[PDB]
PDB file of C-alpha atoms in Angstrom:
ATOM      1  CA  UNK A   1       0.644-109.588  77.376  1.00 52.99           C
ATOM      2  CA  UNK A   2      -1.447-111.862  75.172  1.00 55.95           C
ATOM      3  CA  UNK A   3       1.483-112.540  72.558  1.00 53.83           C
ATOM      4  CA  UNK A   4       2.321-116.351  72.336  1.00 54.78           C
ATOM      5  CA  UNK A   5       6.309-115.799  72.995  1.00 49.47           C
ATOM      6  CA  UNK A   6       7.175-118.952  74.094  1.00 48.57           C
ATOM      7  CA  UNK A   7       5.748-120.602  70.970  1.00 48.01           C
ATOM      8  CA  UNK A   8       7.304-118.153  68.852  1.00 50.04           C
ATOM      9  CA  UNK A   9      10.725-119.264  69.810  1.00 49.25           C
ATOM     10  CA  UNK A  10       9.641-123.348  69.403  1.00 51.38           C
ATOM     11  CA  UNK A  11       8.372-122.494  65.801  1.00 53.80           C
ATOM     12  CA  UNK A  12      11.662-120.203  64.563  1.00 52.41           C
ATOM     13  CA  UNK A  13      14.060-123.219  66.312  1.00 51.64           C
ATOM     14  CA  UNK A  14      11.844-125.847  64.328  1.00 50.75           C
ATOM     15  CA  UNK A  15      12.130-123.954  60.778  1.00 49.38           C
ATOM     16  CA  UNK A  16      16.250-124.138  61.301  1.00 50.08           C
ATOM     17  CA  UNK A  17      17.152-126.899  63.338  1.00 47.55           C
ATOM     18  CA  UNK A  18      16.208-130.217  60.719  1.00 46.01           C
ATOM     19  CA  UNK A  19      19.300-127.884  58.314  1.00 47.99           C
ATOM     20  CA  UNK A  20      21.612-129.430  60.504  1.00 48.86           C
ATOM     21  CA  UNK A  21      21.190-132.462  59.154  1.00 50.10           C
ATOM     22  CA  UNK A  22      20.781-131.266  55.562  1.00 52.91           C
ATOM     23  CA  UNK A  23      24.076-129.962  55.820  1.00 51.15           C
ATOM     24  CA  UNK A  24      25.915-132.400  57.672  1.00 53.82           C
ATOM     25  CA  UNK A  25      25.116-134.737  54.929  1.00 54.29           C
ATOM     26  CA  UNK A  26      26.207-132.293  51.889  1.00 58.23           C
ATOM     27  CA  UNK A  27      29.804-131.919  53.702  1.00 59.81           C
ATOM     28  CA  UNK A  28      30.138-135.557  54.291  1.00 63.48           C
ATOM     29  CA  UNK A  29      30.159-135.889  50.450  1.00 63.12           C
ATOM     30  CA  UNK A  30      32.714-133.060  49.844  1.00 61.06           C
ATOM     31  CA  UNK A  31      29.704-130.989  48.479  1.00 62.79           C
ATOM     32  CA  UNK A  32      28.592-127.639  49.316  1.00 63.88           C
ATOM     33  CA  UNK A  33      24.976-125.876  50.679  1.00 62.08           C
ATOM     34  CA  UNK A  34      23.835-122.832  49.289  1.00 62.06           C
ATOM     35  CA  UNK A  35      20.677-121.087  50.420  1.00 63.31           C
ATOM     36  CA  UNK A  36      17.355-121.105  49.284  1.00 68.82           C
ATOM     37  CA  UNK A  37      15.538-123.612  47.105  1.00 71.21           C
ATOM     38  CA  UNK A  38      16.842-125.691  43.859  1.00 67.52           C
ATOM     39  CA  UNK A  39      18.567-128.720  42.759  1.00 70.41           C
ATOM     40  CA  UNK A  40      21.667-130.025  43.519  1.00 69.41           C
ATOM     41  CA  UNK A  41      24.318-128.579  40.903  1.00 69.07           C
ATOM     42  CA  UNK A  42      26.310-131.243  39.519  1.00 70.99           C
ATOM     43  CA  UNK A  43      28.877-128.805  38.043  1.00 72.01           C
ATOM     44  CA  UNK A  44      29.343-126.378  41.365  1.00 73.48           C
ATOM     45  CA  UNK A  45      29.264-129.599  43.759  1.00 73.16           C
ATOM     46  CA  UNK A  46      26.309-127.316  45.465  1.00 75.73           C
ATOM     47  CA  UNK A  47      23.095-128.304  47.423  1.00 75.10           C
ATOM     48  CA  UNK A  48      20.541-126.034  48.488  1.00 73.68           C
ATOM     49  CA  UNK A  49      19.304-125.891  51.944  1.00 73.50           C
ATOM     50  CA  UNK A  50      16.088-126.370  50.293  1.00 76.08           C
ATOM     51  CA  UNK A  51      13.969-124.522  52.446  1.00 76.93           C
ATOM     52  CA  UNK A  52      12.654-120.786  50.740  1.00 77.57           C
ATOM     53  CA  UNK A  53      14.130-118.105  53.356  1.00 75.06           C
ATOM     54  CA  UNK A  54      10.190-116.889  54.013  1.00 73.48           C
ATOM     55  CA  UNK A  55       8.953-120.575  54.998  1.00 72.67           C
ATOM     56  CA  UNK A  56       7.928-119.472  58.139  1.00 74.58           C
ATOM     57  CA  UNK A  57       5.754-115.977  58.675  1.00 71.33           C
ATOM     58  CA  UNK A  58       7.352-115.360  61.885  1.00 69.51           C
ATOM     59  CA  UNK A  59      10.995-114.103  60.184  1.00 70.12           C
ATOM     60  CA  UNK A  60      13.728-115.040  57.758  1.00 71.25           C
ATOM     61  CA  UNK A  61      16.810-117.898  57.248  1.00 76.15           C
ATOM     62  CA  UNK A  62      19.672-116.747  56.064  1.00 72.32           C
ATOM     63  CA  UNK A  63      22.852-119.031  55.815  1.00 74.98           C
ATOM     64  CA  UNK A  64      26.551-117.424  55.868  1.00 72.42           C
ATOM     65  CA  UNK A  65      29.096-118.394  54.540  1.00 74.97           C
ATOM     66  CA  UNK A  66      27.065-118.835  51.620  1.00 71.49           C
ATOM     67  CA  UNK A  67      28.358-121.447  49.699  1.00 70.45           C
ATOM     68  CA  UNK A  68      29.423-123.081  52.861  1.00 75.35           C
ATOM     69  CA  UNK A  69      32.059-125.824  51.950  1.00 80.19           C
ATOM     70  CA  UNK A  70      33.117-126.730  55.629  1.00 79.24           C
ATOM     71  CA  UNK A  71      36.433-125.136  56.171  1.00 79.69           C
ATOM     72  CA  UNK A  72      35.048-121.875  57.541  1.00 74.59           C
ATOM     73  CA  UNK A  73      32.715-121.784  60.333  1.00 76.01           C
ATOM     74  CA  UNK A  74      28.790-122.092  60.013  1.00 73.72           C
ATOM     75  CA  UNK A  75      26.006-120.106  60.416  1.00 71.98           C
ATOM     76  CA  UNK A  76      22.241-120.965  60.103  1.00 71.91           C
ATOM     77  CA  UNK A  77      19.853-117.408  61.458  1.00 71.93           C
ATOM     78  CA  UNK A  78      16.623-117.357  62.303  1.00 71.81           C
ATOM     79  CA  UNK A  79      15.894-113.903  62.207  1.00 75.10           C
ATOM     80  CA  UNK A  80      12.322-113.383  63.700  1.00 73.85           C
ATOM     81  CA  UNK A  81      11.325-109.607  62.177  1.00 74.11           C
ATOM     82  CA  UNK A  82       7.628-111.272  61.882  1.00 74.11           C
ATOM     83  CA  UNK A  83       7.122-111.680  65.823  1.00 77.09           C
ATOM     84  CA  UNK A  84       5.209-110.158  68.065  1.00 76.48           C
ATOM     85  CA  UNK A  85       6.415-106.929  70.133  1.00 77.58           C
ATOM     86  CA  UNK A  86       8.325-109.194  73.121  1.00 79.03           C
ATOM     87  CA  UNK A  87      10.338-111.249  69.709  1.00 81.66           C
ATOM     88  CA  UNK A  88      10.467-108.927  67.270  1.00 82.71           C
ATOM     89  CA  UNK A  89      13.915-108.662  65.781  1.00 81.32           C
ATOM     90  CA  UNK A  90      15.482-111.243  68.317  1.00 81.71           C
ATOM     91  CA  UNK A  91      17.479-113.372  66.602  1.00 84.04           C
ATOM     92  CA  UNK A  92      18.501-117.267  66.948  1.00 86.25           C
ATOM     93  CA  UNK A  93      21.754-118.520  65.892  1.00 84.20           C
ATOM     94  CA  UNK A  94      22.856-122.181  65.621  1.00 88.75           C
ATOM     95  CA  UNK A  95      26.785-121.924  64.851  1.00 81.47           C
ATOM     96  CA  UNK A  96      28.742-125.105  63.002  1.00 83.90           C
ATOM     97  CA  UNK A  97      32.369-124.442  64.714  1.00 84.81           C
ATOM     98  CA  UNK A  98      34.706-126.034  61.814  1.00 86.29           C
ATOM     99  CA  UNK A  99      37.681-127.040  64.125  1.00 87.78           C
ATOM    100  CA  UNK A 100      35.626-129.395  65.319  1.00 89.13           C
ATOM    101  CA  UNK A 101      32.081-129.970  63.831  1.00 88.88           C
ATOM    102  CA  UNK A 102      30.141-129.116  66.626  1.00 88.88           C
ATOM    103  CA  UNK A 103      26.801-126.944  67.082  1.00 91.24           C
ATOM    104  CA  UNK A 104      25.830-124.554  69.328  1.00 93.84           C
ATOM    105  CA  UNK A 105      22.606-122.626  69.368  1.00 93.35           C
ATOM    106  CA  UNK A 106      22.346-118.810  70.763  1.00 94.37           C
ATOM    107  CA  UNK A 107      19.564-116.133  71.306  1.00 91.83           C
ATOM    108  CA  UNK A 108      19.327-112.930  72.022  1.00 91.88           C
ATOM    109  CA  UNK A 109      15.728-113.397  73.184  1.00 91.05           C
ATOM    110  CA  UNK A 110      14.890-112.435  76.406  1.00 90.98           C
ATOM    111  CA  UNK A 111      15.753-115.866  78.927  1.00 88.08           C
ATOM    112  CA  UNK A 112      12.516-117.041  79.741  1.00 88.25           C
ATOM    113  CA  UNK A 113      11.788-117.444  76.006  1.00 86.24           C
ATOM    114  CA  UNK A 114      14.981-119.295  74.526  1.00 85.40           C
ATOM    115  CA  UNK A 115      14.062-122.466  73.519  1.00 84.87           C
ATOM    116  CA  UNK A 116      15.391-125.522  75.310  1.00 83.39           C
ATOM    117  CA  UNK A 117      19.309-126.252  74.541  1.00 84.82           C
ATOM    118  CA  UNK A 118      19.929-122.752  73.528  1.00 82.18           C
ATOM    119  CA  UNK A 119      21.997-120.049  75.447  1.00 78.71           C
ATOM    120  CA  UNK A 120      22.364-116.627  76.024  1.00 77.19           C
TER     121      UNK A 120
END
């Protein structure tokens, strides 16, 4: 009843959302993004994300595909197995829809905690 659920979901949306832009800008140069932490790869045409996948306590980023080159759909998780008991292994997905290059977010959280713009 104490648990801070609300801010849980504002902090695991803030550790994936600012990616967005990290990746729209490796695709716009014909580049890839791979996950984790690095330098660019001159050879590979690769960028990493460049965030480590345990940057924020309260769960774990994963990217798939990963390499992502932008003919295959996108997906950037937020998977929060650090949470408290009411987001514990609730998971936010923002999804990069190649046909078009839009984003959509989803959670699994319970309603009153997904963050604003999200959906069930």
């Amino acid at each position: 009843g104490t648990e801070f659920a609300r801010s849980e979901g504002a902090s695991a949306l803030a550790s994936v959302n600012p990616l967005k832009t990290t990746v729209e800008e490796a695709l716009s140069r014909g580049w890839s993004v791979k996950s984790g932490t690095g330098t660019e790869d001159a050879t590979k045409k690769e960028v990493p994300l460049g965030v480590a996948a345990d940057a924020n306590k309260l769960g774990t980023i994963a990217l798939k595909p990963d390499p992502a080159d932008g003919t295959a759909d996108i997906t950037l998780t937020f998977t929060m197995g650090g949470a408290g008991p009411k987001n514990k292994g609730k998971i936010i997905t923002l999804t990069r829809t190649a046909a078009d290059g839009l984003w959509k977010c989803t959670s699994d959280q319970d309603e009153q905690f997904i963050p604003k713009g999200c959906s069930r």
